[PDB]
Amino acid sequence: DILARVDLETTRAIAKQMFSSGTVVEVSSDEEGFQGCWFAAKVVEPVGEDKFLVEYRDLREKDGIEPLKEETDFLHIRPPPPRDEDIDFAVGDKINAFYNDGWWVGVVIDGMKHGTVGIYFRQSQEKMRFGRQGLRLHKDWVDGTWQLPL
Amino acid sequence: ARTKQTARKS
């Protein structure tokens, strides 16, 4: 999945450059039930040469009060993507939808009507209308550059 | 906000 597209040496160096204490980022997970999800977070401090202690913007510890803190590695952290807040989704577009406090990969199945866009999620096999404000085009962070899907 | 498993799917 992962490394076929990115370069480890480059990705590590760029993560070291960009993700210092206080830096806003997005983080991902390879735990089940989280595939194609990016969560908003902020770097607390780098950890060793490979990892970053982050504090989540929206996710909480079990009391639902204190922000969740986790270590993440350089392959599961990225900057917030540039967002073109005013664009027209076309059917077939790979998007992210802000759903249950994460950004989830989905596909546009119906163009915008009444300020909503029809979306489908392969993870859950569910489809629904999403307000335009909670949608963005999917982008990949690769070797220090943002790229659209191939 | 929500807990990490309130955000988890399936």
UniProtKB/Swiss-Prot annotation, chain A:
Phenotype seen when the gene is deleted:
Abnormal transcription up-regulation of some transposable elements (TEs) and of hypermethylated loci (including MU1, GP1, SN1 and ERT7). Hypomethylated DNA CHG and CHH regions. Reduced H3K9me2 levels. Increased ratio of decondensed nuclei.
- State which tissues express it: Expressed ubiquitously during vegetative stage, in meristems (e.g. root tips and shoot apical meristem), and in ovules and young seeds during reproductive stage.
Residue ranges for the region (Plant Agenet, chromatin-binding) are 17-85, 87-143
Q: Which domain of life is it from?
A: Eukaryota
Question: What subcellular locations does the record give?
Answer: Nucleus
Known role = Heterochromatin-binding protein that preferentially occupies long transposons and specifically recognizes the histone H3 'Lys-9' methylation (H3K9me) marks, with a stronger affinity for dimethylated H3K9 (H3K9me2). Required for transcriptional silencing, non-CG DNA methylation (e.g. CHG and CHH regions), and H3K9 dimethylation (H3K9me2) at some loci. Mediates heterochromatin phase separation and chromocenter formation.
Q: What does the record's free text say on domains? A: The tandem Agenet domains (AGDs) mediate the specific recognition of the histone 3 lysine 9 dimethylation (H3K9me2) mark.
Query: What protein does this entry describe?
Result: Protein AGENET DOMAIN (AGD)-CONTAINING P1
Q: Which organism is it from?
A: Arabidopsis thaliana (Mouse-ear cress)
Gene from which this protein is expressed: AGDP1
